[PDB]
Design a protein around this ligand. Structure first.
Ligand SMILES: OC[C@H]1O[C@@](CO)(OC[C@H]2O[C@](O)(CO)[C@@H](O)[C@@H]2O)[C@@H](O)[C@@H]1O
Ligand SMILES: [Zn+2]
Ligand SMILES: [Zn+2]
Length: 412
């Protein structure tokens, strides 16, 4: 606990630039293909090891997805004229979220595997995002995920992957351990704020101290509307930029916890690494890339969760430090790493930057015709970025849902 969070300040957010082609996702084809007519996917969680490397097993790449049925022929998802309401179906998906797995030898053209957990295993019906960790070369996996409604609880469930020449099976994801919820002194609770953010575990082992940590999305503790916007939250804003409007309502942070030992069954909540008080309510899906001795800390956020008199695109923001606990500097001087183009501002979401520079996202909403839009619920084209010191550059584009492994684990 002997470090201070690094604030992402109003001054930093004033540097955010939409449509910088070095930090903008290429336009999604409005005629994009869909990976499944039966299911929607969104948040995609590649199988990884404790350092962030994407791993295949016996040559099979694996992804875990937040997943819901498409209610195309479900009377309950017809409007008053009896027609399928894809918008209502898509916006309802959060309440229906389940974690499923897919597999592929190529890192694309994913084969559907089905549910990770049998219905009823998850303490909450909703299964929200986290990270699947391959623990060893015996195929043991810990899926860290979020249990939502009632409350918001980071949890884990341990199972096994089995492979053959024809595919992959997941087995034994039967026992969920609840790890922790918001505490109220460091991280905001439901009691303090009905709209509190607490989700998306991303565990890692730090070789500098050998300890098992996790990132997660939180908010800074305190009753909704009471937070002080400090000079450190402002940063060095220019003349005329002192009016923050209702910015005290935006209190996102990247939380950190440490495991009592490497089993990861017991956790100690620590101060956050990044705070965005007066800047953004949502620093979602925090994840590291460890490169050239540096800590690259990425988080996803929304245009519409910026505080008054700031703005930026939906997409991936990031920070870099030489030390786990900071100080951090914003990537590309503003924080923005990969934003949606302003002509298709909601085309993709849940950007996830992998250590190979590949960034996956799902297709959300693309402008279609007049005021119509197309809903995705399918993978977006993967983007490749280069990380160079405290800057990033878009340098290539790949197929829809291309998420190759960085190394292949041979099971024993
Ligand atoms: O009906 C609109 C609704 O359907 C989807 C299904 O993916 O789009 C279908 C729409 O896309 C084309 O196939 C073009 O690619 C059209 O021929 C068809 O009408 C959703 O994306 C959309 O919300
Ligand atoms: Zn590794
Ligand atoms: Zn082993």
């Amino acid at each position: 606990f002997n470090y201070k969070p690094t604030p992402w300040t109003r001054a930093d957010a004033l540097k955010v630039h939409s449509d910088d082609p070095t930090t903008t996702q290429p336009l999604v084809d409005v005629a994009f293909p869909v990976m499944s007519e039966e299911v929607f996917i969104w948040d995609t969680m590649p199988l990884r090891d404790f350092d962030g490397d994407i791993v295949s097993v016996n040559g099979w790449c694996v992804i875990f997805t937040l997943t819901a049925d498409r209610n195309t022929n479900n009377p309950d998802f017809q409007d008053e004229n009896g027609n399928y309401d894809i918008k209502r179906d898509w916006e309802d998906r959060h309440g229906r979220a389940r974690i499923c797995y897919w597999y592929s030898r190529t890192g694309k053209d994913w084969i559907f595997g089905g549910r990770v957990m049998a219905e009823g295993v998850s303490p909450t019906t909703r299964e929200w995002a986290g990270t699947p960790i391959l623990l060893n070369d015996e195929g043991d996996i810990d899926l860290y995920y979020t249990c939502v409604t009632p409350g918001a609880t980071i949890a884990k469930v341990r199972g096994k992957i089995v492979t053959s020449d024809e595919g992959v099976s997941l087995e034994g994801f039967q026992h969920v351990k609840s790890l922790f919820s918001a505490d109220g002194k460091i991280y905001q609770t439901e009691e303090q704020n009905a709209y509190w953010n607490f989700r998306d575990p991303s565990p890692f082992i730090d070789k500098n101290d050998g300890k098992l940590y996790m990132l997660f999305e939180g908010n800074v503790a305190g009753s909704r509307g009471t937070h002080e916007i400090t000079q450190e939250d402002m940063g060095s804003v220019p003349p005329g930029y002192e009016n923050v409007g209702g910015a005290r309502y935006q209190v996102g942070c990247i939380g950190l916890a440490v495991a009592k030992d490497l089993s990861g069954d017991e956790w100690e909540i620590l101060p956050p690494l990044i705070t965005a008080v007066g800047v953004n309510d949502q620093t979602e899906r925090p994840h590291f890339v460890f490169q050239e001795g540096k800590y690259y800390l990425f988080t996803i956020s929304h245009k519409y969760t910026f505080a008054d008199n700031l703005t930026g695109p939906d997409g991936v923001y990031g920070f870099v430090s030489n030390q786990l606990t900071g100080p951090y500097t914003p990537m590309n001087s503003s924080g923005l790493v990969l934003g949606n183009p302003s002509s298709q501002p909601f085309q993709t979401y849940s950007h996830y930057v992998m250590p190979n520079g590949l960034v996956t996202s799902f297709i959300d909403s693309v402008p279609w015709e007049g005021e119509k839009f197309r809903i995705g619920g399918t993978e977006a084209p993967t983007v490749k970025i280069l990380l160079k010191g405290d800057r990033s550059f878009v340098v290539d584009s790949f197929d829809y849902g291309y998420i190759p492994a960085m190394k292949d684990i041979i099971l024993k």
